Design a protein around this motif. Structure first.
Motif, short mmCIF file in Angstrom:
data_model
loop_
_atom_site.label_atom_id
_atom_site.label_comp_id
_atom_site.label_asym_id
_atom_site.label_seq_id
_atom_site.Cartn_x
_atom_site.Cartn_y
_atom_site.Cartn_z
N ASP A 127 1.08 -13.97 -6.85
CA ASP A 127 1.41 -12.58 -6.75
C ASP A 127 0.04 -12.15 -5.91
O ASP A 127 0.11 -11.04 -5.44
N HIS A 182 -0.31 -6.49 -3.84
CA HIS A 182 -1.50 -7.12 -3.35
C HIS A 182 -0.77 -8.49 -2.53
O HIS A 182 0.08 -9.01 -2.83
N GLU A 235 -1.82 -10.06 -7.57
CA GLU A 235 -2.03 -8.86 -7.83
C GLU A 235 -3.52 -8.46 -8.88
O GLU A 235 -3.95 -7.33 -8.78
CA LIG Z 1 1.71 -9.63 -4.37
#
Ligand SMILES: [Ca+2]
Ligand SMILES: [Cl-]
Ligand SMILES: [Cl-]
Ligand code: NA
Ligand code: NA
Length: 446
Positions: A308, A337, A310
Motif C-alpha cells: 500500500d 500514498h 503508506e
Molecule cells: Ca496506497
C-alpha cells in the motif's frame, strides 16, 4: 583464478559506441580457446540470452593451441552476425608477472591486426587476461605503459581493455596507477577491468568501494569477470549487478560452459547450446538486474493487500528510472500514498518497478495492481523458482488521468511457493518521448 593449493571511444567514465551512445556491457565470457569447435553453438546460444557482449578467450600459443587469424576473423563474424560486441582477450599470460608473457600477447594482437583494424565499432581488445598475478600496482603499470604504445604504433585503434593486477582482483592498482596507464595511450581510448571474485567482491562494501575507486579516477570500468562464489569464498553477485546498473558499469559473467571440476559451479549453461541454463545462468539471464532486464544492444547493430506504500517504499526498487522510486501522496488508488518514479521515455522504451524478495504465494490464484503515468502500456509480472521463470499478463494501455488495474492469473504459475520477484514492466509507445512519472499502488493477491 589461481590454484586452490570510427568506433568505440572512452570519455571519462563512459564508453560510447560508434554512434555516440553510451554502451553498458551486459554479457558472458566464452572459453573458446579450450573448446574451439563450440564457437558457433556457444556464440548463438549467448546471443539468445539477450547479452549485448561476449568476451572471447583466445590463445597466443603460450599454453594452448594458438588461434589463427582465420579463427579470429570467424569469431568476430559470429559475434557481429548475432549483434554482439566482441571483447577479445589473450589468456596465456594469466597470473604471470613476466614481461615476456605480456609481450607475447602484444605481438599476437599485432600479428592479427588485419582482422581488428576496421572493426573498431564492434571489437574491443582486452590485451591480456589477468596479466601480473602479483599485487604490485607500479610493476603492473610499467608493463602496460610500454605495451599500449606498441599496439597503437602497429595501427590498432580499437578501444583497449586493461585487467587489474592480482589476477584481476587488485583494483587498487587501477586507482593508484590507472591514470598513468591511460595517459600512455596516445589515443586516450583505454578502459579498465576488475575480476570480482572472493577478494575484490566478497561483500557489498567491497563491491561498491572497488567500483567507486576506479570511477573516481575518471576511468571507464567493466567487471570483466565475476561469479556467485569462488575458490576461497562467497562473491556478492547481487550487489555487483545492482550497483553496476546504478553506476552504468559494464559486467561480463564467467562463464558459459567448460570450467574444470574445481570451478564447475561457474558454468552458466549445462549445454553448449544454452537450452538448459544452470541456476547461476538463470541468475545472470533472468534474475533481477540481469540480461533480460538491463541488456541493451549496441546501437551500431540497431483478497489481501501486499503493498500500500503508506509508510515507505516497502523494499521496492527499479531499473531504467531517472530518479526514484519514492512513496508519495501526490496520487494514490488506496490510502493516501503510492510508489512513484521518474523516467525518460524513448521509442518503445521499457522501465521497471519491482520488489526483489523471496516469498510464497501458494494458494493464491491472482495478483493485481493499479498503475498510471503522469502513451504507455504495462503488465504485472512475477518470477518463480531457481530459474527465475517469468510469468506476466498481457500489456494493457494505461493513462495519466486515472489508475489502470493490471492483473495476473496465478492458477497456472509453477513454483508459486518460490516467488523471487514481483513487479510491473512499463513500455512506452513507438512515438513516445520525453519525461514522465510512473506510479503503482495497492498490490493485492487473492
Ligand atoms: Ca496506497
Ligand atoms: Cl565517478
Ligand atoms: Cl553514477
Ligand atoms: Na579468471
Ligand atoms: Na554469492
Amino acid at each position: 583464478g589461481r590454484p586452490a593449493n570510427s568506433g568505440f571511444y572512452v570519455s571519462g567514465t563512459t564508453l560510447y559506441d560508434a554512434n555516440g551512445n553510451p554502451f553498458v556491457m551486459r554479457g558472458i565470457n566464452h572459453g573458446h580457446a579450450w573448446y574451439k569447435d563450440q564457437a558457433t553453438t556457444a556464440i548463438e546460444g549467448i546471443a539468445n540470452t539477450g547479452a549485448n557482449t561476449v568476451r572471447i578467450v583466445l590463445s597466443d600459443g603460450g599454453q594452448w593451441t594458438k588461434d589463427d587469424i582465420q579463427t579470429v576473423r570467424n569469431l568476430i563474424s559470429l559475434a557481429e552476425d548475432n549483434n554482439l560486441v566482441a571483447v577479445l582477450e589473450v589468456h596465456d599470460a594469466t597470473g604471470y608477472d613476466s614481461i615476456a608473457s605480456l609481450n607475447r600477447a602484444v605481438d599476437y594482437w599485432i600479428e592479427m591486426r588485419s582482422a581488428l583494424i576496421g572493426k573498431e565499432d564492434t571489437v574491443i581488445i582486452n590485451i591480456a587476461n589477468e596479466w601480473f598475478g602479483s599485487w604490485d600496482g607500479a610493476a603492473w603499470a610499467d608493463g602496460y605503459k610500454q605495451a599500449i604504445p606498441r599496439l597503437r604504433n602497429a595501427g590498432l585503434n580499437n578501444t583497449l581493455m586493461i585487467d587489474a593486477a592480482g589476477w584481476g582482483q587488485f583494483p587498487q592498482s587501477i586507482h593508484d596507477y590507472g591514470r598513468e596507464v591511460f595517459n600512455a595511450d596516445p589515443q586516450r581510448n583505454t578502459m579498465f577491468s576488475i575480476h570480482m571474485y572472493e577478494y575484490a567482491g566478497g561483500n557489498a562494501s567491497q563491491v561498491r568501494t572497488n567500483i567507486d575507486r576506479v570511477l573516481n579516477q575518471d576511468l571507464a570500468l567493466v567487471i570483466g569477470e565475476f561469479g556467485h562464489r569462488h575458490t576461497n569464498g562467497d562473491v556478492d553477485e547481487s550487489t555487483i549487478m545492482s550497483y553496476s546498473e546504478q553506476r552504468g558499469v559494464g559486467w561480463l559473467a564467467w562463464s558459459w560452459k567448460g570450467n574444470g571440476p574445481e570451478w564447475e559451479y561457474l558454468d552458466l549453461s549445462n549445454d553448449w547450446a544454452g537450452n538448459n541454463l544452470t541456476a547461476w545462468g538463470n541468475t545472470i539471464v533472468n534474475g533481477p538486474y540481469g540480461l533480460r532486464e538491463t541488456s541493451k544492444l549496441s546501437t551500431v547493430f540497431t483478497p489481501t493487500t501486499l503493498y500500500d506504500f503508506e509508510e515507505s517504499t516497502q523494499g521496492w526498487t527499479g531499473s531504467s528510472l531517472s530518479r526514484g522510486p519514492w512513496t508519495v501522496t501526490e496520487w494514490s488508488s488506496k490510502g493516501n500514498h503510492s510508489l512513484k518514479a521518474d523516467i525518460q521515455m524513448s521509442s518503445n522504451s521499457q522501465h521497471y518497478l519491482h520488489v526483489i524478495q523471496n516469498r510464497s504465494l501458494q494458494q493464491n490464484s491472482r495478483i493485481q495492481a493499479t498503475v498510471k503515468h503522469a502513451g504507455m502500456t504495462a503488465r504485472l509480472y512475477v518470477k518463480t523458482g531457481h530459474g527465475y521463470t517469468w510469468y506476466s499478463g498481457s500489456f494493457v494501455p494505461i493513462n495519466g488521468s486515472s489508475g489502470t488495474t493490471l492483473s495476473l492469473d496465478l492458477s497456472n504459475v509453477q513454483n508459486l511457493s518460490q516467488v523471487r520477484e514481483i513487479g510491473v514492466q512499463f513500455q512506452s509507445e513507438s512515438n513516445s518521448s520525453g519525461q514522465t512519472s510512473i506510479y503503482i499502488d495497492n498490490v493485492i493477491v487473492e
